[PDB]
């Protein structure tokens, strides 16, 4: 799970 | 005559989105300041029903979003399971704002089904990261997916083209197993960069294998090289897939001056891509997306509305509610930054050759 932000 | 999805109340809802406050008003205001709305058919959006939204999103996710939206409970403990948190805060009203945006895109698609227009525009749509059961990347409901599912009532092959800075992972995921919808995304692809997916080798799954197309691109690309890549891919895709309708996501976070400071595009480069697609004379649904230099995003989508209308706009920003946001020069044109293009021609060529190999199976 990446952060956008 | 293009349909323009708009109402004052709709724009006011879209203005409350946490990562882009006031952007919808700025975009509409500048379009209106150039009088482009007088050359389009203005259509008020219908709000999406729960049944509309549940054609893609799960009941459990929709119920959670409805719950935390009621009072803006950004401290609910179950929000991280549903993707809410830093990127997607539980802004008060977000469930209804998202249903309005989803309904606006569905309304655009219905206008296209009915032959009301050949181009329908929802500049406040394009929230392409949202998953069936998860908010993601500032997207709570995936209006692009909802719009494609509405077009599927009539069109057996839909081409989704995604020119946002980010990979359109939510739309690609939704249709990964089907060949009725081909997704094509050009995006920055670099480990650590959101959402982390969309390599050229990601081509979809099962019956949808080779019906997803990804163009991974590095920092610094400018108008000419971007259009060359885009036209090359779309030429092959059009010949191989023969779409009957197009959904085009035009996130302006690629544009020079965006705080994300990744691509180095101007609206002219994106406009050339848009013109290439419009020349196909297919039913075309136009969406917004990212764009975090708000004035530049209004500049871009205003210019692209002109491109849709075949109209050349004056360089001078006209007087309007947000005039002072365009200072000190008050012109529509955007100037690229003086930083390097990290895209090597040999790498771009191999990406294009890999895609052409993929599309032979189509
Ligand atoms: K993209
Ligand atoms: K697909
Ligand atoms: Zn984006």
Who contacts B207 (Cβ-Cβ below 8 Å, separation ≥6)?
A: B177, B178, B179
Angle at B28 between CA B22 and CA B29, to 5 degrees: 85
Q: Tokens 């690309």 — which residue? A: B221
How many helices and strands (H and E) does chain B possess? 11, 8
| B54: number of Cβ within 10 Å | 14
Helix, strand or coil, per DSSP, at residue B285:
strand
Q: Is B57 a catalytic residue?
A: no
Quote the tokens at residue B148. Answer: 């494609």
User: CB A2 to CB B192 under 8 A?
Assistant: yes
Q: Which residue of B has its CA nearest to A5?
A: B87
Cα–Cα distance for residue pair B76/B85, rounded to 1 Å: 9
Who contacts B3 (Cβ-Cβ below 8 Å, separation ≥6)?
A: B40, B41, B42, B43, B108, B111, B116, B117, B119, B120, B121
Contacts of B192 in chain A (CB under 8 A): 2
Cα–Cα distance for residue pair B184/B24, rounded to 1 Å: 26
Residue B331's φ and ψ, nearest 5 degrees, are -125, 160
Q: Does B133 touch chain A (CB under 8 A)?
A: no
Contacts of B258 in chain A (CB under 8 A): none
Could you tell me if B3 and B111 are in contact, meaning their C-beta atoms sit under 8 angstroms apart? yes
Cα–Cα distance for residue pair B14/B91, rounded to 1 Å: 12
Q: What is the DSSP letter of B339?
A: -
Could you tell me if A4 and B292 are in contact, meaning their C-beta atoms sit under 8 angstroms apart? no
Cα–Cα distance for residue pair B307/B286, rounded to 1 Å: 12
Q: Tokens 């008060």 — which residue? A: B92
Could you tell me if B158 and B151 are in contact, meaning their C-beta atoms sit under 8 angstroms apart? yes
For residue B328, whether the previous peptide bond is cis, meaning omega lies within 30 degrees of 0, is yes
Could you tell me if B277 and B307 are in contact, meaning their C-beta atoms sit under 8 angstroms apart? no
Determine the longest span between alpha carbons in chain B, in angstroms.
54
Number of domains in chain B: 1
| B89: number of Cβ within 10 Å | 19
Quote the tokens at residue B258. Answer: 């965006």
What is the signed CA dihedral for B294, B18, B271, B279, rounded to 10 degrees?
-150
Q: Is B328 exposed, middle or buried (CB count within 10 Å of its CB: 0-12, 13-18, 19+)?
A: exposed
Could you tell me if B200 and B215 are in contact, meaning their C-beta atoms sit under 8 angstroms apart? yes
Q: In terms of Cα–Cα distance, which of B279, B88, B91, B246 is closest to B163?
A: B246
Method: X-ray
Quote the tokens at residue B304. Answer: 């692209």
Q: Does B187 touch chain A (CB under 8 A)?
A: no
| B296: number of Cβ within 10 Å | 21
Q: In terms of Cα–Cα distance, which of B223, B225, B239 is closest to B351?
A: B225
**Helix (H) or strand (E) segment spanning residue B14:** helix B8-14
Q: In DSSP terms, which residues pair with B245 in a beta bridge?
A: B158, B283
Note the Cα B258 to chain centre separation in Å.
16
Q: What is the DSSP letter of A4?
A: -
Q: What is the DSSP string of B106-119?
A: HHHHHHHHTTS-SE
Q: In terms of Cα–Cα distance, which of B138, B118, B116 is closest to B127?
A: B138
Q: Does B170 touch chain A (CB under 8 A)?
A: no
For residue B309, whether the previous peptide bond is cis, meaning omega lies within 30 degrees of 0, is no
Contacts of B195 in chain A (CB under 8 A): 2, 4
Cα–Cα distance for residue pair B132/B197, rounded to 1 Å: 17
Cα–Cα distance for residue pair B28/B265, rounded to 1 Å: 22
Q: What is the DSSP string of B293-314?
A: SHHHHHHHHHHHHHHHHT-PPP
Cα–Cα distance for residue pair B51/B201, rounded to 1 Å: 35
Resolution of the determined structure in angstroms stands at 1.8
Cα–Cα distance for residue pair B344/B350, rounded to 1 Å: 10
What is the signed CA dihedral for B291, B297, B302, B304, rounded to 10 degrees?
-50
Q: In terms of Cα–Cα distance, which of B244, B40, B237, B220 is closest to B123?
A: B40
Three-class DSSP labels, B201-234 = CCCCCHHHCCCEEEEEECCCCCHHHHHHHHHHHH
How large is the C-alpha radius of gyration of chain A?
A: 5
Crossing angle of helices B267-278/B294-309, nearest 10°? 30
Range of the structural domain that residue B310 is part of = 1-362
């Amino acid at each position: 799970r990446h952060k956008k932000x | 005559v293009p349909v323009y999805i708009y109402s004052p109340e709709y724009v006011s809802m879209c203005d409350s989105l946490a990562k882009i406050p006031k952007r919808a008003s700025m975009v509409h205001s500048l379009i209106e300041a150039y009088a482009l709305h007088k050359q389009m058919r203005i259509v008020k959006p219908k709000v999406a029903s729960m049944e509309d939204m549940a054609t893609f999103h799960t009941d459990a996710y929709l119920q959670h979003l409805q719950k935390v939206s009621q009072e803006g409970d950004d401290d609910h403990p179950d929000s991280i399971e549903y993707g809410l948190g830093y990127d997607c805060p539980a802004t008060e009203g977000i469930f209804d704002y998202a249903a309005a945006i989803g309904g606006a895109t569905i309304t655009a698609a219905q206008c296209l089904i009915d032959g009301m227009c050949k181009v329908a525009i929802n500049w406040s749509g394009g929230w392409h990261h949202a998953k069936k059961d998860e908010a993601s990347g500032f997207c709570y409901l995936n209006d692009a997916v909802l719009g494609i599912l509405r077009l599927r009532r009539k069109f057996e092959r839909i081409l989704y083209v995604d020119l946002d800075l980010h990979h359109g992972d939510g739309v690609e995921d939704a249709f990964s197993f089907t060949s009725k919808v081909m997704t094509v995304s050009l995006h920055k692809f670099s480990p650590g960069f959101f959402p982390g997916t969309g390599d050229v080798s990601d081509v979809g799954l099962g019956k949808g294998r080779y019906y997803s197309v990804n163009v991974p691109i590095q920092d610094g690309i400018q108008d000419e090289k971007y259009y060359q890549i885009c036209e090359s891919v779309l030429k092959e895709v059009y010949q191989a897939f023969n779409p009957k309708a197009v959904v085009l996501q035009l996130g302006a976070d690629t544009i020079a001056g965006d705080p994300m400071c990744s691509f180095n595009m101007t609206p002219v480069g994106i406009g050339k891509c848009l013109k290439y697609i419009l020349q196909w004379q297919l039913a075309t649904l136009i969406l917004g997306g990212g764009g975090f230099n708000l004035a530049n995003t209004a500049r871009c989508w205003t210019y692209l509305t002109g491109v849709i209308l075949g109209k050349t706009l004056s360089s001078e920003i006209p007087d309007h509610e947000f005039f002072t946001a365009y200072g000190p020069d008050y012109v529509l044109e955007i100037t690229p930054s003086c930083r390097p293009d990290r895209n090597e021609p040999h790498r771009i060529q191999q990406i294009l050759n890999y895609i052409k190999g993929n599309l032979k199976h189509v």
